[PDB]
Each structure stands twice: as C-alpha cells, then as structure tokens.
C-alpha cells in the first residue's frame, strides 16, 4: 500500500526517536492548543475509524529504514561458521532498508544496513541525546483519508516544528496479502499475539516489528482527560511453519 | 529401597568394574570384577544393598536364580522388578555411549590427555598435555579411597554422585585412543537415562529404544544482565547474581522432585541454562506445564518483564541419543528452535498480560555462609524466596534446614542430617576483603590501582561454544564438555586470581608485581561467561592470565573474546556493563580470539580494527613496554625528563588517524627508541593492513595511566 511519509529534518540533536504513543500524544497536545478538545475528539474518531500512524524510524538521503519483523528470527536457517555468526548479527539488527524489509516480509534472502544513520552519544556530568548523520533524520507513516491529514496531522506537525522542520512525500511498501501482519507502531494488543517483544512504560506495549493475527490494537482514555494510542499499523507478513 | 532408587544407583554403578580391573585386584573383566568389588564391600561394614547393586556389572537362566538367592522381599522389591532394573540399565549403558593404562583424552583437544589426578580446585589446574600411561598403582590407591568413601556414604544417588565425581572425573570411561568421555559422566548419564525409561513405564523391551519415551528439557533465562546490572553497591550486585543462581536451582530441583528424578538427570545447569533428560509420560508434560507456568507467573509478579524463564521440551527416542551416519545434535537443534520461539513469546503463559532489603542482608551475610536450605516459603529464618521454595542461609555454626541443602564449593556433605538431600553447587566467589570483614567497594578497589585511580571492568565470553557443543555425539560427551567448560569459570578463575599456575601462564602484560590478596571482585563467572571488577591495572593483567589459563585448559583449541573498561569509581554499574558489552561484542564483531584493551581513535575506512588479537597485543607489550616501563608505576628513567616523547607518538598516530594515506607521520619522526615506527612499512600496505604506528597506542596509553 501507498502512505504519507512525514519527514522530520532535525534542527539540532534529538532526545528520543519517538514511537507511536508519544507521536499521537504530541499531535493530540498540538490539536488541543490550535483547535480545542472538539478537534482531539474528531482525531480519536478518525483513528478508531481506521486511520493509523507508525512509530518514527531513521532515514538517510533517499533511504527509508523500517523495523526488522520478528517473523525472520525463527526462519534464519531458511557454511557452519558463516551461518551462526551472521544469524546473530541479523538477530541483533533493529532496522532494514525498505528494499530488504519487503524481502524479509516474504521470507526471501535479504541483508542488513551496515551503517545506521544515528548514534546514541551519552555525555557525562548524566543524560543523553541522538546525533544525526548528514541529510539524515527521522520519519513516520500516515495511512487513512487526506482530509484528516490536512486538517489535523499536518498542522499539528508544523506547530511541533515551530527542534525540526517538516516535509512529506508519498511512499509505497509492497507487502504480501496474508492472515498475519507486522505493526510499524507499538500497540496495546486486544488478542494475544504471534511473535513480540514487551516494552514497559505504567503500560505494557507490544514493540514495533511484533507479529499479530487480525489485531487492530486499541486506544485507552484515563484521568490524571488523555487518550493513549496503541493501534496496530499492519503490513501482511509471510510466516515460517513452526 | 524402592525400584526407582535401585534403577538410579543401578546405572550409577553398572561400570564401576573398570577402575577395579585397571587396579588388577580381581581376576576377571570389568563386569565380573565389578560384581566381586561390591559384594566384598557389601560384607565389609555389612550393608547388603551393595550385593543387590553388584548384579548390574554382570538366556537369563543363571541370573533369575542369583536374584532369587538375594531374597527380594527383604528390600520390599519383586523379583520381576529387579529383572527390569537390570535390563533397563543394560540398554541405558548402550545409549549414553583397548589397553588398561590409557588416560582420559581432553574433550577440547582429543590429541592431548589428562594426567591422573582427583578433582580438586585448590590444587593444580587440569592441562591437557603429552599422553602418559597411568600406573596400576594409582588405580589401586584410587579403588581404596573409593572403597573407604562408599563404606561411609548413605547409598542415596546424591551421596554416591559426589564421591564418584571426586575420584572418577579424570578416568577414561573406555580405554580406546582419543576417548573424550569422563567415567563419572557416563555413569550419571546411564543413571539419568535408566531412571527416565523406568518412569516412562516401559519394561522387558528389546520398544523404549525406537519409541519416543524420553524428554529433552532445555530451560533458558532471557534478560540475565537486564536483571543483575541496571541497579540504582557491589555487596548488593553480588547478591543479585547469587539470587539468580538460587531461582534457577529452585526451578530445577522442583522439576526433579515432581517428575521423581535425581540430580544425575541434570546434564548441565550453568549461566542460567539447564538441560534435563526425563520420561515422556503425560503426567510428566502436565507436571512440566504446571511448573513452567507457576514459575513464569512468579517471575512476572516479582520483577515484571525484566527476567523471563523460557522452558521447552521435545519428545525424543533412544535412537536420538546416538549417531546414524548425528541425531543427538539434530534433537538439540530442533529444541533450541522451540526456545528461540518461546523467547519471542515472553510471558505468553500469562493471559492477564494485556489488561529488595532482603538482598542487602544476604549481601551482608555473604562472607561466612556455607550454603542455603530449600524449605517451604512460610518457615522461620527464610531470607530469600524463589518461585517454589524459601531459602534459609546456612552459616558455619548453625544447623542446615529443609528437604534439600545447597552447599557451596565442596563435594563432601560435612555435618548435614542423614535424611537431607545433598546439592553441591560451585561458584567463582573470589572477592578482596576490606579492613572490615565484608567484601570491598568500587571506591576501595579503584584507590588500590598503580597510577590513575580508575575501577577496572572486564566482560569475557568463549568464542563459538554453541558450535563446539552441537559437535558432541552422545549425552555423556555433552556432559563432559558441559562440566569441564563450567568448572574452568566456576572452579579455576578463583585460583587464576590468587596467583596460581605461574608456569602455565608465564609472562603476561603487567604493571605491578602480582599481590597476595589482589584487588579483584568476581560478579558473575559460569557457563562460558564472566564479569569481573577491580583495580584497573590488576584487571588489565588478569584478562591475559585468564586467556592463557584457558588456552592451556583447552588444547589451544578454544578462544575467548574480552572487553576491558577503565571507569571513574562513581560511574553507575549499568553504564559500565553497556560499554564493556559494546567492547566485547565489538571484539567478536572484529573476528574472535581478540581483546578490547582500551578505547582508541582510528580511521573509519573499514581497514582498522579497535580490538587486538591476544597474540598481537602480547607481542606489542613484550616489544615496547620493557624499553619505556621499569615496573610498579615507575618508568625506565632514561624516559624521566622525556615522558613527552610518548605523548608525541600519540599525536603523530593521530595525524595517521586524520588520514592514513598522507605521508606526514614519516616527516615528523633518542630516535633509537621505537625503530619499527619510523619506516613506512610496505608489506602492511601490500597486505592491505594498518601501519605499525596505528597499534602502539594500546601499549603507551596503558603505561601513561600507570605512571601518572
Ligand atoms: N558450561 C556450559 N554447559 C552447557 N551449556 C553452556 C555452558 N556455557 C554456556 N552454555 C550455553 O551455550 C550457549 C552458547 O552461548 P553464547 O552465545 O555465549 O556462545 P556462542 O554460541 O559461542 O556465541 P558467541 O561466540 O557469539 O559468543 C548458550 O545457550 C549458553 O547458555
Ligand atoms: Mn559464547
Ligand atoms: Mn555466554
């Protein structure tokens, strides 16, 4: 399917590569400050309706990176010393380039990014930041109607820009039609999932790259009113029989 | 006696005829000579159970009568029971699968052999060396101490195992050339396989062999370092590491209890990775499914998603314990897959998923403690709790308490009640003592360093171990491989720290004379893995001492990768762990058999490795250190008033790092000192390698730390 890539060109270093809950959290706040809580309600409605945002991933030049699906982890056998050592370096990789992501979804042979376009420098005094390589940065995917993008997501991202600036292009991922899907977002699962990594925040989240079978995730409203985004951003994934 | 204890002790003594033949005490083969030894021992002291156990070392006409003469009613056993016990153990001996002077050949290097000695971590380090015949004297001195110990032992599997381990550890189970298997391991594995067949409910079969009546049970903990490290003190951090050990033991001993098995069924249990051979009765898989779930639920309630226990098991046949054209590795491979998947479904055994002061006292009461008692959770004195049991610290003065007693770094019970099951557990628990009786601190260790006052850290791992173990043929081979590997870290790292094995280690990169009470604290060491802190200079040297000890212990056939860290004493433990981890799996990423000595500048042209080959650094130190370093934090003195020429080389090397193709570092270059670095090395350019200058910083930066 084809998607809107929201490219964040950074004006300095970042603290987090933000994931879907904090991205929605930020966009939710912006829309409150621009259009009041009537607009927040219309945004939750669009999202509960079928609209989705991904978590933020690195980009370098005209190379989009995506999360390694956990589907390949048990299928890496699909030399003796060539096998073990690569199979670990793949198992540790957290990102694939779009081209190799689309291959990993179909359980065909793929390869790893040799350089990832960011490094976690943690200066002592202690707390840390994220240094971006040249013409590199972070982006996230929007799926759903254009009228919701133009009237909520776009204004909100520009408002949040005022540490970065914002530009967006059409982006296409080819994904197998399948019973099974990867989430490009961290989700609060409704059904119990297939393959996953837990992620503690206090909410228990499914990580990006986790595999679900027809799980849309869900939103959670609470009082401290604030909405917590945990909807799945599914792409169909070919699974190995195990 | 019941059939279950007889079938255990049965396979555990089947081949005790081998040590008595090789002593030349009787006039028969091992099966016949083994029978005579136990009958003669049975009459001595006067315990007839040994005459019952002598039947194992031997149309079925004669044997039915020899069973009958030993009235089976006596021990509350049927005649027909004992006949299976015998036949069962006979099959077991074949599944776990010639002069009489041959020694045990090393599982690491089958070319080299072990000198006959008894397992003792206090005296000497087992080095595979030149093949020597063992005298029939040494075997007689063996068989007599062996005879004296069986005389006093309580005749349960847990009192027999330890004395069979102490004496028969460095003995060839078969006296063929290139024989890899320790006798103890063949004995514990036959006892394991025999008892498994019994529980599987098969008897008089010649069935259990070619039908899936066994279970391989591999349990693996995920997020061990995310549990131990990532804390807000060292006393505490040690109790964390010590608490992980008891949790694993609480699970293993629970599995052994509920399945009705013995410690012989534990193929291994180290690095929070345990394997168990067991029956494939449904009651077993039900009892397994109960334990696995109740254990995970406890882990979740107690620590959240930090520490998970992935327990899996496969139905396996007698065929798959052996080779046909390597089925055993094949059965372990299919099981490792079951684990990898279960590790990608962390806490999936909970459906409610998508909806400590005690360690300080434990860390404080750590120096003088002998072991722990496995009691029920609600019981007086219980200091820590696992999923299934409360743990009662057992101190030098006090009585032990509970069904099971876990005792540390001995194979002799000592004074523990006759009813109490003995559980020997080994751990590398060296620690530099304070002025106070308690263990030292990051501050005190860091202060005790030559030159700069940094805390030293090293994380160490064995290269391609998984490959080495999957190349093992039979359960007994894996058992020897497992135990010897684990005993290097759990046993000998203590001795290597103390300053032992001087002749085997030799001249290593060092800064001071090796102290009598070195400023070193072991955090974790077991199952191919170790994490150790101390005075940076003492830690730096220990890395090379351990690598050489390990080189000798293996047949120069297995290699380590190590990451070293030199940190501000105030740096939090979690930051230190990530950097040495970053440096370790770098050393492995840059090839293996190499050490990350110290952080370094370099060209990012993919031709310049941060890590050093052990032999590369050892050569560099031998070359340069003696010209510029006198020892114990002092320089040569020709260098005094010229500590500056060293700093100048580090600045000259920096303009090789700016651009290694620019030929200015040739321009810049007494000049006697370092003639290897002035020339523009050519073979290096041809071979597509770094220039000598690139490498020297590793020596110089370490000396300059020692001298400041
Ligand atoms: N003494 C031992 N007995 C049995 N299994 C062990 C022992 N020590 C380690 N293991 C297990 O062997 C496996 C090897 O782990 P590890 O990844 O550290 O080694 P490896 O396969 O050689 O990989 P690498 O060389 O990349 O470190 C793990 O499952 C570990 O728990
Ligand atoms: Mn290893
Ligand atoms: Mn390891």
Swiss-Prot record, chain A:
Keywords: Antiviral defense, RNA-binding
Transmembrane helix among keywords: no
GO BP: any one term: defense response to virus
InterPro entries documented for this protein: Csm4 (IPR005510)
A GO MF term: RNA binding
Similarity field: Belongs to the CRISPR-associated Csm4 family.
Other noteworthy facts: Encoded in a type III-A CRISPR locus.
Subunit structure: Probably part of the Csm effector complex, that includes Cas10, Csm2, Csm3, Csm4, Csm5 and mature crRNA. Interacts with Cas10 (csm1).
Function as written in the Swiss-Prot or TrEMBL entry: CRISPR (clustered regularly interspaced short palindromic repeat) is an adaptive immune system that provides protection against mobile genetic elements (viruses, transposable elements and conjugative plasmids). CRISPR clusters contain spacers, sequences complementary to antecedent mobile elements, and target invading nucleic acids. CRISPR clusters are transcribed and processed into CRISPR RNA (crRNA). The subunit probably binds to the 5' handle of the crRNA, helping in discrimination between self- and non-self.
Protein name: CRISPR system Cms protein Csm4
Source species: Thermococcus onnurineus (strain NA1)
Organismal lineage: Archaea, Methanobacteriati, Methanobacteriota, Thermococci, Thermococcales
From Swiss-Prot, chain B:
Pfam family, any one: HD
Keyword Nucleotide-binding: yes
Regulation: ssDNase activity is inhibited by EDTA.
Record's cofactor remark: Ni(2+) and Mn(2+), but not Mg(2+), Ca(2+), Zn(2+), Co(2+), or Cu(2+), is required for ssDNase activity.
UniProt keyword terms in alphabetical order: Antiviral defense, ATP-binding, Endonuclease, Exonuclease, Hydrolase, Nuclease, Nucleotide-binding, Transferase
Entry's EC annotation: 3.1.-.-, 2.7.7.-
Coiled-coil positions: none
PROSITE patterns documented for this protein: GGDEF (PS50887), HD (PS51831)
Keyword set includes Chloroplast: no
Cofactor requirement: a divalent metal cation
Stored SUPFAM superfamilies: HD-domain/PDEase-like (SSF109604)
InterPro entries reported in the protein's UniProt record: Cas10-Cmr2_palm2, Cas10/Csm1, Cas10/Csm1_subtype-III-A, Csm1_B, GGDEF_dom, HD_domain, Rev_trsase/Diguanyl_cyclase
Other information: Encoded in a type III-A CRISPR locus.
Subunit structure: Probably part of the Csm effector complex, that includes Cas10, Csm2, Csm3, Csm4, Csm5 and mature crRNA. Will form a homodimer in solution, interacts with Csm4, which is a tighter, better association than the homodimeric Cas10 and uses the same interface for interaction.
Cited PANTHER family: CRISPR SYSTEM SINGLE-STRAND-SPECIFIC DEOXYRIBONUCLEASE CAS10/CSM1 (SUBTYPE III-A), CRISPR SYSTEM SINGLE-STRAND-SPECIFIC DEOXYRIBONUCLEASE CAS10_CSM1 (SUBTYPE III-A)
Name this protein carries in UniProt: CRISPR system single-strand-specific deoxyribonuclease Cas10/Csm1 (subtype III-A)
Lineage summary: Archaea, Methanobacteriati, Methanobacteriota, Thermococci, Thermococcales
Gene name tied to this protein: csm1
